[PDB]
């Protein structure tokens, strides 16, 4: 069968199918009306439609047949380093431009340049970005670069000045939930009430991660029998999210303040296999956004959680770090 990830399967085909990015789509349409396409810089929250919009613009520029030959898609973060990305760009640019057919010429403008798309460009180092700017300058005649990133401020000024910048607003919760609901109905995914909302909350509004999690949950539902509905516990299990009941129990154990009880609970918690980083993140979310704690408690707990997260990021023993974090909070 034609198995395909739901993220790429449900990408909008044309610019008119982008839902909430009115400003960026309008500016891109105005630029497309002009015969000249400048270098583009797409920035905004993750999962807003940057890649979808650039692919739709490429489709409208070239045609479904020519766009595959005229496009090189790279990920500067997942790649080995600067050398691989820049050599691939050089090889793509040096390659002869594919000749459009009569149908492509008579149906689409088919501009004489090829578009190179970089994903997660902000993750590049300053030297990598300077090398990318030099490569763009060298081959600016026949290639136009579109940089996709989450933070425009992570891109150096010399590279950013060469690119016209388009800002994508964060998707509204209603729009994201409607998109997820439409995707689920088309794929015949039985979802219980609040499952899509839970998926969006876990993904933190990232529609890409939400669609990926929905597809993963659908696959799991096939394996489990009885044809039952997908429930929030299943998506929490698939996303590696500790259940809220365990978090409440951790909070109560911290509140009681007994060192031995906290140590015993952490010992019995590590046997369940739940990730310690997820516990730290959920504890941060619970405590910071809680109206029952005063300013001083949150001031101390923010530093405590920051220290625990920094120590966990170094590849340490989760049990010791979690026990230390829970003991320190109970003393506040």
């Amino acid at each position: 069968l034609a198995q395909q990830p739901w993220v790429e399967k449900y990408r909008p085909k044309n610019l008119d199918e982008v839902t909430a990015q009115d400003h960026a789509v309008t500016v891109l349409k105005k630029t497309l009306k002009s015969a000249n396409l400048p270098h583009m810089l797409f920035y905004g929250p993750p999962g807003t439609g940057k890649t979808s919009t650039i692919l739709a613009l490429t489709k409208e520029l070239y045609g479904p047949d020519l766009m595959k030959s005229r496009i090189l898609e790279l990920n500067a973060s997942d790649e080995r380093g600067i050398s691989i990305v820049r050599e691939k760009v050089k090889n793509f640019a040096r390659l002869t431009v594919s000749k459009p057919s009569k149908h492509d010429l008579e149906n689409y403008p088919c501009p004489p340049y090829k578009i190179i798309i970089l994903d997660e460009a902000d993750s590049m180092t300053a030297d990598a970005q300077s090398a990318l700017r030099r490569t763009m300058e060298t081959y600016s005649g026949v290639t136009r670069f579109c940089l996709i990133c989450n933070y425009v401020t992570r891109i150096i000024d010399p590279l950013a000045s060469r690119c016209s910048k388009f800002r994508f607003k964060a998707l509204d919760a209603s729009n994201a939930i409607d998109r997820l609901r439409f995707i689920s109905e088309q794929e015949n995914v039985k979802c219980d009430d609040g499952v899509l909302e839970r998926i969006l909350d876990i993904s933190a509004g990232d529609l890409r991660r939400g669609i990926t999690l929905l597809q993963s949950a659908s696959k799991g539902a096939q394996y489990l029998g009885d044809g039952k509905n997908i429930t929030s516990t299943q998506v929490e299990e698939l996303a590696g999210v500790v259940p809220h009941d365990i978090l409440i129990e951790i909070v109560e154990k911290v509140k009681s303040g007994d060192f031995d009880e906290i140590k015993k609970y952490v010992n019995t918690f590590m046997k369940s296999g739940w990730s310690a980083a997820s516990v730290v993140n959920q504890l941060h979310e619970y405590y910071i956004t809680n109206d029952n704690f005063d300013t001083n408690f949150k001031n101390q707990i923010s530093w405590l959680l920051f220290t625990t997260d920094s120590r966990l990021n170094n590849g340490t023993n989760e049990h010791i770090q979690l026990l230390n974090l829970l003991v320190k909070i109970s003393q506040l």
Binding site: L238, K271, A276, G315
Partner: protein
């Protein structure tokens, strides 16, 4: 052979604990063609490798257990000639790329490309996936994308946190909690009935399960050791047998608690040197020492809080250092100062 290996379940039907996971694996094996990439995470000695082998047996057959071991030689950059022990079967492969240190990415790439070219599909089991370098994980993601047609990865790790998000998105997260004490007691009861071991009461199995802290492998080996010492007749008064390194660490904890001085620190250094030289990992030593110190009944809350804080600090330092004895001695000295 040892009872831990003789009575290991060789099929999905032979599993006795975590029935939901067994049902999930049985459902997975019913559709071999669309088998996803798997990532199993949980505490050590809970049965992850056994479950992976049982799933492989359910998919391919009993021939997965006909295992042969070979050494593959790889010529890397600057002509570094490497050896990797690859446990292979006519249906699957098992690798531990973390044994190659920082050269895991190139070994993974070369071997996975070779396996894909040699090929419905061949399953590759990667042990200690959490200890793979990030470059190795990126190479694994690349091989997953390129060779998903002929390669199905089954990654086993104790914690999924070091795993990168791109790997998690393309793999099925499977959580394997440690068995409860009742399930461990049932397994040990089956083992002792198979081996015809006399029991004064069933509470001995409960004590063994409690002493193993949910580690099924440790519980089985402890039961075998206790049975051998008691002439195949376990009594209610039979002491729980602990490994040599655990006994040494407990003795060190008692010594640290009893006397806090520079000479005691020197003798603790000697004990730590003895432990490290005999293939006891530094992180294991630190964790065991910390959790033995926290179990002393003569220490108050302040002492235990200081101990756990110093343990966290020096665990971070161990993960970022080279010479482990330095950090272990620093932690012991800080604990001695806090107790005094």
């Amino acid at each position: 052979s040892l009872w831990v290996d003789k009575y290991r379940p060789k099929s999905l039907n032979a599993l006795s604990h975590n029935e939901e996971l067994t049902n999930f694996l049985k459902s997975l094996s019913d559709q071999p063609r669309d088998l996803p990439h798997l990532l199993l995470y949980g505490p050590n000695g809970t049965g992850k490798k056994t479950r992976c082998m049982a799933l492989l047996e359910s998919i391919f057959g009993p021939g997965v257990y006909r295992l042969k071991i070979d050494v593959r030689q790889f010529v890397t950059a600057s002509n570094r000639k490497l050896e990797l022990n690859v446990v292979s079967s006519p249906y699957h492969l098992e690798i531990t790329p973390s044994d190659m240190g920082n050269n895991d990415r190139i070994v993974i790439q070369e071997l996975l490309k070779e396996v894909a070219q040699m090929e419905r599909y061949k399953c590759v089991i990667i042990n200690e996936a959490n200890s793979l370098t990030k470059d190795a994980q990126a190479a694994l993601r690349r091989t997953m994308e390129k060779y998903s047609k002929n390669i199905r990865l089954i990654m086993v790790c104790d914690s999924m946190s070091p795993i990168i998000a791109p790997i998690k998105s393309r793999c099925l997260l499977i959580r394997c909690p440690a068995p409860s004490d009742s399930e461990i007691s049932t397994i040990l009861s089956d083992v002792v009935t198979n081996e015809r071991i006399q029991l004064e009461t069933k509470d001995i199995l409960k004590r063994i399960a409690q002493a193993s802290n949910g580690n099924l492998r440790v519980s089985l080996l402890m039961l075998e050791s206790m049975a051998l010492n008691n002439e195949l007749a376990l009594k209610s008064s039979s002491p729980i047998i602990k490994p040599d390194w655990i006994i040494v660490i407990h003795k060190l904890t008692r010594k640290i608690v009893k006397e806090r001085s520079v000479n005691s620190l020197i003798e603790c250094r000697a004990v730590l040197y003895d432990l490290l030289a005999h293939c006891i990992p530094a992180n294991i030593i630190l964790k065991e020492l910390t959790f033995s110190l926290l179990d002393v009944e003569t220490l108050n809350t302040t002492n235990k809080s200081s101990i756990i804080e110093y343990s966290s600090v020096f665990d971070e330092r161990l993960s970022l250092g080279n010479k482990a004895i330095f950090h272990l001695e620093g932690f012991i000295a800080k604990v001695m100062c806090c107790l005094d």
